[PDB]
Structure formats: C-alpha cells, structure tokens
Amino acid sequence: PVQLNLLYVQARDDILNGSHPVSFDKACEFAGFQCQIQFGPHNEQKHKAGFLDLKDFLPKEYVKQKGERKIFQAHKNCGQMSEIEAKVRYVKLARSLKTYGVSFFLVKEKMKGKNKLVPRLLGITKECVMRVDEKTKEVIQEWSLTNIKRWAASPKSFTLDFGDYQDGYYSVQTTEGEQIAQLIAGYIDIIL
C-alpha cells in the first residue's frame, strides 16, 4: 500500500505540473481518479459546481477550460471504487500513455503558412525521437534513433539529419540544443 502511494504521488505530480504531458480528456480522467481518492465516491449534494479548485486537479494549461463537468463525470463513473483501487487505476493509466517516461523539450517550429513559429513538444526516449502536439499531446511524427545520421546543436537551435529516410532535416528553436543533443548521443551510445 505504501509503495502504491509513492507511485501515485509521483505520477499525479508529474501530470499536474506538466512534466508528463497529457490531453485534456486524459487530464479530466485523472482528475476523476484524484477526486474519488480525495473525497470518496461522488455525491451530488456535496460535490456540486464550484466545489473543486481546478488549480489542484488539472495541469495549468487546462485550468481555464471549464472542464469541471468532465471531471465530475469521470468522478461519477468511478462508482463506489476504493481509494486503493482508484490509485491503482491512476498509475496504470499514466503508464499506458505514449507520453509516459518521455523526456520532453518545448521547442518552436518554423514552417510555411506564416512567418510565426509554432511551439512544439519534442520527446526523447532510449529508442526514438518524437514530435508531439503542444496542445493535443498527439504524436505527429516519430523517428527511430537508428535513422539518425547526424545532429547539430547550436545555442539557439537543434538540428536532426536522418539522411536516407526523408528529404530535408528537422530544425527547431531552443536554448537547450545542448541538453537535447547530449541526451540523444548517450542513448545512441548504448544501443550499439
């Protein structure tokens, strides 16, 4: 039980603070689990609009989304679920997500359609590099570390060369081009 509470607090905190990027729908699902755990089964007369301080149940980016309704719906579908069970379900859900355990970096993509830069989520794992929608948290494009020919890290950007995979590179604006590059180099070094 105690081990379960450590895993829970970690997964919850990583979601609430943004460390673990998730969609709006998923954020409300967790909230539901969080509510059950903190308040017990949903109660119409005790748990009514305004009861929840959205700041403690959703990631910053989702507070002003008026999703309290979605949360109470998630809380309601928990039925008479015990705290332990809800905790268990919280973690499993977090671990089942494509974004779980992925080191992310907030970068900016310069494309056509305009001259403005589109913020984007860049994730690095021990076996791949992924482009994630800054908002939807959906995976736009994913690359295999083995497809990387070379990379360039400047104090203002980072570039990836896949050589024989696709035409052109993939550059983004970031002040962590160094951090990202080192991360990749290390992972690649262990594969061989």
Binding site: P1, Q3, L6
Partner: peptide
C-alpha cells in the same frame, strides 16, 4: 545509519 529500500515497503 540505516537507509531502507522502497522495494520492501508494504504494498
């Protein structure tokens, strides 16, 4: 002194 491993904490 002693430092406990989380792996042995109650479930």
């Amino acid at each position: 002194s002693w430092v406990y491993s989380p792996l042995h904490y109650s479930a």
